[PDB]
Design a protein around this nucleic acid. Sequence first.
DNA 1: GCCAACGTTGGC
DNA 2: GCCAACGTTGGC
Length: 74
Amino acid sequence: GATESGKRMDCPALPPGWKKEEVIKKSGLSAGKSDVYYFSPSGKKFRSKPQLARYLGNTVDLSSFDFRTGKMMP
DNA sequence: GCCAACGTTGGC
DNA sequence: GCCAACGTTGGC
């Protein structure tokens, strides 16, 4: 489910077609930690909440959006 | 030229 | 001291 890594998965808190993936760092000082990425319906990758907000504009309110989990967490 | 994966760091 | 957010870069 939602806490699987290495798996592209729907993010139901975002508009239709958005997906999320958690990538485990393979090497270096933070090996084993993770980065979370989002993918637009067109497949473009997004790496931060401000980046999502710039792109989505007023079609979403990301104020309570938790980037790491992909859930709204007021 | 693109882009995933690394490391950096300002703001907290 | 941590980490959200991003810049850089080698490998392609």
